[PDB]
Each structure stands twice: as C-alpha cells, then as structure tokens.
Design a protein around this nucleic acid. Sequence first.
DNA 1: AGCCGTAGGTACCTACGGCT
DNA 2: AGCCGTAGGTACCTACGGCT
Lengths: 192, 192, 484, 482
Amino acid sequence: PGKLADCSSKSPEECEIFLVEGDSAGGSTKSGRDSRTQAILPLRGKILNVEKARLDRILNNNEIRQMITAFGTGIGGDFDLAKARYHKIVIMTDADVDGAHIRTLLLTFFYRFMRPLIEAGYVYIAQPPTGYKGLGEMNADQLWETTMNPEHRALLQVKLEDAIEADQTFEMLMGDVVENRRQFIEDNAVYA
Amino acid sequence: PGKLADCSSKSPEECEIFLVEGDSAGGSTKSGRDSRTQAILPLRGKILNVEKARLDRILNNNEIRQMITAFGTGIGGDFDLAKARYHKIVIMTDADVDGAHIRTLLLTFFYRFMRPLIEAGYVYIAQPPTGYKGLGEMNADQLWETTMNPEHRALLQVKLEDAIEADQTFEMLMGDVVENRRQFIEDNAVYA
Amino acid sequence: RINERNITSEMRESFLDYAMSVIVARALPDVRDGLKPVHRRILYGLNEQGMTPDKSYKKSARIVGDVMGKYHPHGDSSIYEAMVRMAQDFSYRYPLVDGQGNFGSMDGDGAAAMRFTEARMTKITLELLRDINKDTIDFIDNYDGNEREPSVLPARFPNLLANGASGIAVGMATNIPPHNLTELINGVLSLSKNPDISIAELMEDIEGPDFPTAGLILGKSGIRRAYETGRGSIQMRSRAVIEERGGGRQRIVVTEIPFQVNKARMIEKIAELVRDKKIDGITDLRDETSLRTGVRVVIDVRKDANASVILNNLYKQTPLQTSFGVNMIALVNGRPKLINLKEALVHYLEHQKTVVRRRTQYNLRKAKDRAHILEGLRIALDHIDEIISTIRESDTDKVAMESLQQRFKLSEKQAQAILDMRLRRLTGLERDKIEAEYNELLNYISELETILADEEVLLQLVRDELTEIRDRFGDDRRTEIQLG
Amino acid sequence: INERNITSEMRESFLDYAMSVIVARALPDVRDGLKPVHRRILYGLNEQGMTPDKSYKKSARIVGDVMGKYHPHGDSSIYEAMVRMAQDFSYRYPLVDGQGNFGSMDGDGAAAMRFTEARMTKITLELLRDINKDTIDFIDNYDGNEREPSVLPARFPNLLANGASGIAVGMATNIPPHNLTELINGVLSLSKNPDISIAELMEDIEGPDFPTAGLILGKSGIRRAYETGRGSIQMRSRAVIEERGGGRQRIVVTEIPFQVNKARMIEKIAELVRDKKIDGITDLRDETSLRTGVRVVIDVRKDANASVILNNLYKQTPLQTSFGVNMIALVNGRPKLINLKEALVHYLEHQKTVVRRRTQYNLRKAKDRAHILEGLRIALDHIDEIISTIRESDTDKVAMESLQQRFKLSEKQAQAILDMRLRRLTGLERDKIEAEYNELLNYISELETILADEEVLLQLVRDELTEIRDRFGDDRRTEIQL
DNA sequence: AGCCGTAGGTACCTACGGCT
DNA sequence: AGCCGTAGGTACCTACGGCT
Ligand SMILES: O=c1ccc2ncc(=O)n3c2n1C[C@H]3CN1CCC(NCc2cc3c(cn2)OCCC3)CC1
Ligand SMILES: [Mn+2]
Ligand SMILES: [Mn+2]
Ligand code: NA
C-alpha cells in the first residue's frame, strides 16, 4: 500500500503493524514509532462492515485490500499464517466512542476473513490515553511513550474462547437483522 | 458541461450565460437568475493561462472544454459565430482582486481562441457590488437586483479597438517573459 | 505487559458503548426541547456570543470554530451542515437560524463554504433560550471539563413537534413530522385543562402535520394511527393543477412538492420514465422555478391525451407522491422511547411547568438577596458619617468588614456591598431611590410567593406565556389535508 | 450597457491583481519580516491572549477568528501558514508553539485543524511586545469593522532571522534564515557605526544559519548575496563514511539541506539505483527517529570507493542543493531588492521609532494617571468636605460641577473621585494611592530623560536587543566550510 | 522540468434504519 | 434502490517566478 509506512526489519517475528484512523493520527504515529520494527497503516475513518456486505463489495474496498496486501497471509480458505509479515497486528483507533466502533468493524473483518490470525494470538488492541479527540491531537513523543513503546505500553492480546458464541456475537452485533441488535441494546444498556 | 445549469429558451438571441468562480457563487446565481433566458456555468477558481500553456494541455483542460462545449462555436479556425448558443457571455467573477485575475485569464482565453466572439460584441463583464468576498456571500435576490436583472444591471460590453495593441497587451501581461510584465508594473504602479 | 482480552467481551462492550452514545448523544432528539446535541450546542453558542436577531450577522466560521472548541468535539462539517439546515425555510417549519448568503436550495445544492456565509438567531429561537440564565434547566460539564453547557433548553414553544426530527441511530431510528405552531399550542392548552383528553379530541386542535413545503396529505387514517401509536404512514402529494397552454393543448403545473423531496431529482426521475417509455403522453418537462414565481414545474401533455390520467400515473411512479413514515422515537428521561401525540405533549407541558416553577424560585432567591443588600445600603446611607469614619479608621478590608458588622448588625454580604459602594451613590436622591426599589421588591416577592403557593396559578401563568407566543409566532397552516 | 476596451480592462485588472500580490500577499515587510497572513495570525494570537503561559488554544478557533476579523481568504491558506510557523525544520526561530501533528520533513501535512492546538512561542512575545503602546500604526481591516496592525514592533530582526520565500507577480523573493546572536551583534555594530561596511558586518554575520543545519560550501555566494541582494549558495548534507563490519562501509547522512524533502530525496536515490544510473549502493534505509534524530544510511558494496559514491550522490540528487538568494522586501510599502546592510538599517530605524513612540506613550499615560491620583489625593486630604459636597448634590452632574468648583478639579479628576469605592478609604488603600503617585513621578522623570537625549534612547535600544540576544540567542547550526 | 508557499476552487468513501 | 442526517476519513486542479 501507498499509505503503508513499513518498518526496516524483514523478520515477521519482531515486526508490528499499527492500524490507525487516518493521516491525522498516522502523522504522529509515523514520527513517534520505532521504524525498525513498527509499521503504520492509516485507514480512512469508518471501515466497511463485512458482516453486512457481500463479497464483491468487500474485495473491492480499498482499505480492506490494503490490509490484506500488508498482512500478506491472504484471506478465507487461502489464509496462510506462515506468510504473515507481522506477528503483531495492533488496532490503534482514536480514544473516542467512534474509535470503539472502528475497532468492532476491524475485529469483524479479522474474525470473518482471517480467523487463524486471531487464534494464533497475533491481534492486539493498543490502549492510548483518554481525553484526546484523535491521536493527531497528541505529540509524537507522548504517543510513543504511552502507547507504542514496548517498555511502558499495555497491549491487550485478543483471545477467542468459544467460537460458537463468537459467531453469534458477530452476527447479532454486526449483521443485517436490526431487531436482535435492538434487543441486545435494551437488555444491556444502563442509562442516566 | 455537467456543471452547466442551462436556460429554457433555445433561442440564442435572447439567451445569456454567466461564468462564475465556483459553486459557492453558483448557488446564489442559480437561485437569483431568470432560468428562461439565463444559463450558469460555475468554474473552479483560477483557470489555465492559455498564453503560457501548450495547446495539447489547453484542449485537455476540463474548464476550457466545458466552456467550449457550452458556447457551441468551436475554437480557432473552426470557430463558427452562427453556432453560438448565447449572444451574451457574461464574466461574473467575485469582486475581489482574485476575481479580477480570473477575469484577465478568461479574457486571454476568449482573445486567443474565440476572438470573433469578442468582435461580435458577445462578451460582457458583470459588475457585482464591491463589499463581498464572493457571490456566495450575497442573498440570491440582492445578486439578481444589483447584477443580473436586465432592468437595473450595468453590463460592460467588451470591445476590441486595436488588435495590434491587444496582441502586445496579452503577450506582455499574460506571456512567459517576466521582465516586460515587471517593467509594466514599475511604470504604472501607484503605491501609498 | 500483555493482558488477554476475550473477543466476545470486547465486541459487546465496545459496540454497546457506541450504540448507547449514538442513541443518547447524537441521532435522537430530546422530547423536551426537540433538539439533538449538535443543534443544542449551536443555539447555545449563538446565545453565549450574543448573536441575537437585533445584532448584525456573524461569520459562520467563527460560530463553527467556537462551537467545536467549547462544546462539540466532532467534525466541522457536521456542525456547519446542522446550522445550515436550521436556516432553511424548506427544511424547518420554524427556522431556528437566520442566514445571510448561499444556504442551499430544494435541489440539494449545498450552502456556500462557511467562510462566505453569516448567521444569527431567528426571533423564535429567542423563545428556545428564554430564561436559560434563571436556573430553569440543569447545566453540565462539557467534554473536557473546561466549560459548562445546558443539558436541555427552556424551549418556551413545543419545538419537537413544531419542527419535527429525523435521525438514524443504532438499533432504531426516528421520523417525526413538523406541525403548525398555532395548532400545537392550542393542543397544549386543551391538555392543560383536561389531563384525560383523548387523541381524537386533541386532533380537534392538531389536524395533522404541517410541512414547511406545504402540499397535500391524503386522508386522515395514517395521521390518526401515527398520533395514536407513534407509527403510521402519511401519504404526501404535490400541489398540481391541469391548465390550458394554447391550441387545445394542456399541461400539469406543480407548485408545491412533498416534504424532503429533492426537486431536481424528482424531475430527473420523471425525465427517466419518459425516456424509458414507462409513461405515455408527456411531450415536455421544465423547471420554471424562480424567486419571483416560486416553485413551478411544468409537464406538457400530448394533444388529446387525458392529463388527469397522466397525473395519477406520475403520483404512482415518481416522488410527486411520497410517503412520510412516522416513527416517533425521542429521549424521555435520557432513554429512547416510542411516543404517541399525547405523550409528546404531556412531556412537553411537564417541562414547561418545571421551567416556570424553577424560574419563579430563582427570581424569588434573587429578589430576597437584593432586598437584603438594600437593607444594608439603607443602614449605610442613614448612618453615612459613622460608616465612613469606621472605614477610615480601619487599616484593612477585613477590619472594616468586621467593624461594620458588629456596629450596625450587618451581614458579611451587606458589609461588602457597602465597601463596594462608589461615592456617587451618596448623592441626595439615592436614599429615596433605594426606598422605592425596596418597596417594589417586597411587592414582587409577594407576587412570586403567590405563584409558588398555588399550582393552579403556576399553570395559568404557563398558559398565558404559551398564549402570548401563539399570538406572536403562530401562523397559517400550509399543508392541506384532503379526505381520502 | 457601456463599452469596455479590452486593452484598458486587461491593464487595469492585471495591475490591480499584481500590485495586491506584491504589497499585500507574497512579500514580507522589511521591518518585521512578515507577510499579511503571518502578521494577522500572530496578532490574532495576541488579541485572544494566547500567550505561552496559557493553555493551548484550538486551531479551528484561531483560524476562524483570523479569517473573520482580518484575513478574507481561504481557511487552508491561514492554517497552513500557521503550521509552517510551528515547524522547527521550517523556522529557525519558530513563531508558533503547536501541540499535535504539525507535519514532518517528509512533506506529511499537519493534522486537520480540528485536532491541533497552538499558542505563541516565547520569542513571538518579542515580536508583539509594546504593540498596545502606540508603537506602530493601526489601520482599518478589510470591511471597516476592525483595526489591525500595519506592522509589528518586532523587537528582534525577524526578516533575516527566519528568512522569507514568496512568489509574487513580476518578481519573487528568497531570503535565507540567520543566527539570532550573529544578527543582533551586527545590529549593535551598526548602531555604533552608521558607516560600517558589509565586509565588517560579516565579521558578526558569517552567513545563513538554516534550522536544518548542514554545510555551506565557500563564502563567495554569501558575499555576493550580502553585497548585492542576489547570489547562489551551495548547501550540502552532513554525511560521513564509516565501517559497518566485514570490511564493508556505509554513508550516513544526519543533516539535509534547507527545504529538501527527506522522503523525496531518498526515493530519488532509490530511483537512480533501480535505473542503474549510480554504481555501488547495496542498501538504502531511513533510520530517522525521535530519539536518534535524522539518520539516512546508504550501504556501499564491499571494496567500492565510498567517497566516489558520495560525490556522485551530490551531483545527482538533492543531497547537495543550491539556495538562490534574492532579497526582495517591502520598503516604505514598495518592493525593493536590498543588500544585508540596507536590511539591517531599515530594521534599526524601526527599533528606534518603536522605542521612542513607546517612551512617548508611556509618558502621556503616566502623566494622565498622575493627574488622576492628584485628584484622589486632594479628595483624601479633604474627605469630609468631599462627602458633604456630594451629599448636598441631587444628581451626579451637580456633584461633578461642585467638586470641580470647590476643589479646582478637572472633569476627569472629579469623575475619578465619584467612581472611588468606600473601600479605598481604608488605611492600606490610602497608602496605595500615595505610593503609586510617588513611583509614577520617578517613572515620569526617567521617561523624560530618555526623550531628552538621543544617545540615551539609542543606548536603550542596544540594551533591550542585548537582553533578547542573551535570552534567545543560540549556537550556529549550519557549518560554513572554506 | 517540478518544486517551493500564499492564493481561487471542488468530490467521495464509510456506519446506521426504514421504506416496503 | 438509494435517500434522509450526524458521525469517522481524505486529494488535486489552477497562477505566479526563479532556480534546477
Ligand atoms: O472540495 C473538495 C473536493 C475533493 C476533496 N478531496 C479530499 C478532501 O479532503 N477535500 C476535498 N474537498 C474539500 C476537502 C475536505 N474538506 C472538509 C472540510 C475541511 N474544513 C476544515 C475546517 C475549517 C474550519 C474549521 C474547522 N475545520 O473551523 C472554523 C474555521 C473553518 C476542509 C477539507
Ligand atoms: Mn478519529
Ligand atoms: Mn472567489
Ligand atoms: Na409516488
């Protein structure tokens, strides 16, 4: 990808790719990172919900393509863990509720198209500090120290426990049937 | 042109086309106009200086093409006044210095590629009021009353007097030789 | 330093966070003031910067920059476009913003770039904001803790139903049509005199929606189902007539279109039908709309074709007739709820009662505080020479304050007001001026206590203020409701 | 429908555009070094109190404010100007203190203006210092609803410190940045010798000093530029050759020429290698980091001559780049090609006027305030009679007139007395009035001393410049090699 | 050439629900 | 269908002069 700012090392075991929302966040991320082991792929805001889209639309989507190209594993039946270019794929959305949404959209894609990647423990969630509308609000050094620096950062490693439950969760939250999603919200929402 | 908001009438004798800077101006213009006899072509800011550009690039330029298509006369040797779709082509750039610049750029194109259009008296200059950054700053009704309404408006008809002098003027002001333009400025500028 | 995060847990918590935020703080209006956050923040920002109708227009960029910095931590395009719609007389039945410059058209043209346009409050918006500084509504912290913002506006007219709402949330959406303000206030008045009023009786005041774009509604059954249940389909039809155009030929002339239909797009659709031969008898199609003429779309009919047949076809096959699917979801006590016409009016009236009660309570606290200060000023002026000498013999404020309080039985606040007094307040007619203000205040205090002592008196005050707004801002019905 | 001659129209419309771009867009003023857009940005920061000691303000608010009040052009022009001012690879002395993504040397843009925040740098305080003490002429804004400065006080020589580049009409400008210590030393030299030569001035100002460091090759281009306003200056990357193990070598670049895009320079080298237009390179990496600074590594094939490869890279890529000096600035509102001495002379003359005007202002204001305090002192001296006079007055007007009659007071003094709060009559407050008055009398005589002696005024200019030099002056970054 | 930096100007991706 | 309206996100035409 043109947008992908790759790292220098060509050894997947030690390389990491950070997915960020766009160029506002990408700029701080590029400046603060350790370019030997840390790649950056800026997205472009809300990504396609693959649970609601048909294959043709998915495979034509630019952000989806760039992620598949960057990962190098292929997708679906053709997925090959051995061809992974990074052993850490780190979701680093902005620290707002919309960042959370984008994270659900990214996890839906990984689950439906690259599930072995999750099983292998290769998918992580960054934990940037709260109070900044976007990473582009942070200085590069502050983003490095709090979020990207392996010495101080706290990553969450994404774990799949029960695949049947996960199937139902993706389907309910992300699928085309509104009613079940509505029922979920009513059953779980804790309001004012 | 896709941009072109044409008039009802198909009789060139009574039709007018207004060239404006963009859609900010275009919107007020479209709302204020008399759509029976008044067409509007919004441009996109600074247009190509045809005095400095190569012919191939001129003929590839979208704004130049849209104007040629809208006028219907063809250009240069193929120019045919009888195929004019309007008998008034009205330059209506914003009333700021950049509007003035765009006007000189438009006149350069008309003079070099559609000179008979000027000779026939088909080229006019609108006179919008001075206090507003752009026509999009004006209400539709105020733009109609002051600038577009044939009952109250004051259009300037462009007249070519001396073609040799005009040739030299366009070459000096708009051509690639900086020094003569610099000399013109020094000889004519009245500073504070 | 790596903890494990279960994918199922993550999905459920992240999604619920998003969904709830869109529901309570983005896409759905509050039942009380009819506003979503972005609109409320826009109007509040206009208020805080004194951008009232009597003042000159302010630059759009300044308004947007201010609202984005202080209250709305989202994209500038969201804020500007919200403000633009509020200024459009084809979008808002009672426009909330007064715009100067290119603010878009019914053809789906956008506004000019925000650097070109300028804006202020409309007169009616003053009524949304009326009494906001008299402790009528709860303020809250802004997103970063550096500002305060209103949780809800006083909303002295029923804005949800007057201007309507449409929003796509998560798990749900809303679609509330606009209404005639005279009708609505009449309905509130009726309700205020009869808590047990039926929907059918309320409909004697509120005949149905009233769109800014006028036009026709067909039948009352969709209206009635919507008002009874919160959901119903309402058929909207263009205003069209058939007329002669010479040589024995006819045309259909359309002068009003359905709410939220884009005119240029509707025209393209008719053109397409003709081109693809899906409709017989049309020989020409022109948009003759102008500032002077108003909306005018002309459809020429082929000599000896039946123009009424063609018109009926057009209603069936294009947006010339369009359905409004009512789905009245709003935030009630911070939760999304499907509401009928009566519930919407009940929540509104209850908000008015609280606003006017709280305003009365605030006015009373303030009047008592001011009475207290004037009692202290009375004492100071009656004993001025001793007051001055007490202050002069004091080294500091603290000493003067303490001495004034012991010597003259003054509170801390009274003593402070005396030390803050300018020498010009010692002129000869000031003592009389204090006495006059004090007498008027005691009377005012009594008037306020009367209101708070009698719920009927409170309620009648609400009715009177609503009545006044109705008489000043109420207007004629635009949309015609025809029997099916 | 009146007729308009095409020739007349072209000449008048073009001249209108050309002059506007010259005097009010692309060219900096000789006195403060600024173009309109930059001046309006900093003024806007000042007027909204966005000083270094306060929190960062939202970029959108700064931009919206500047656009509405002062700068009737596109928001992108305003925001991008402000961004550059915050970039330490663009400005030798950055004028804006930015928080968030403000772009990089690789030509990455700043974040969207909604994300970023900004305030003045400490040095910008010196650009704006005394702007409200009638030091500079204000003018009407574009629509007549505001006032804006024609020029900033500019208490350091900003044109030469930060430089300027601008494309106008009929002309352009290209002024390199300079070391602030060197510049102030040069101003000080000039202030003691109006007749100082360029050559002597160059004993203080060795040449340009780019924020990006690097090397300049030779002095002859510098000298021509300083003498005539025009000259070609060869810039080079800072590059060394070092071992990398196994008998192999690499070229390591740690500084690049001013205004060169690092990523673009690297792609150019990659291209040359790919198209076999350069021999001997086996690898190319940008190892730049926040912690290590700029580091571009070019691995050389074992036994190849790394010096030969380096010289080729200078020939074939921006690793070596020229700066064409063309020092055009507005002098008395007109574009003018100026040499180094003219630039310094106009700057020093501006400082003298600023400090004189500031002195005259401070004096008027001190005398006004002394007058008011004389009124309060009279009132305290006769407080009983003051009170009586006011109490026996039915209106403010009558009280004013009686105070003026009884105590020989001016209208301003009488109004000050009537505005005095009763708390001003406590012991500490009374002493405060007396103390302020005594301090003011001393201040007034200090000011009068300055305005009485041109040499003292000039010395004050020198002292204030010296203070700025000591606080903000820094080391030379660019090395000038013979 | 094509870059530098102030200027004039504009177009599409995505989520989300309901219509039907 | 693809549109309604708040949200996340971004790219490229043009003029102008002087240097390569
Ligand atoms: O017009 C077009 C056409 C194509 C295109 N492609 C990419 C792209 O990014 N853009 C494209 N565009 C446009 C531009 C998008 N536009 C969105 C709005 C933004 N506004 C920023 C802003 C302005 C102001 C703010 C805040 N933010 O506060 C008050 C002052 C004014 C500028 C960029
Ligand atoms: Mn974001
Ligand atoms: Mn314009
Ligand atoms: Na229909």
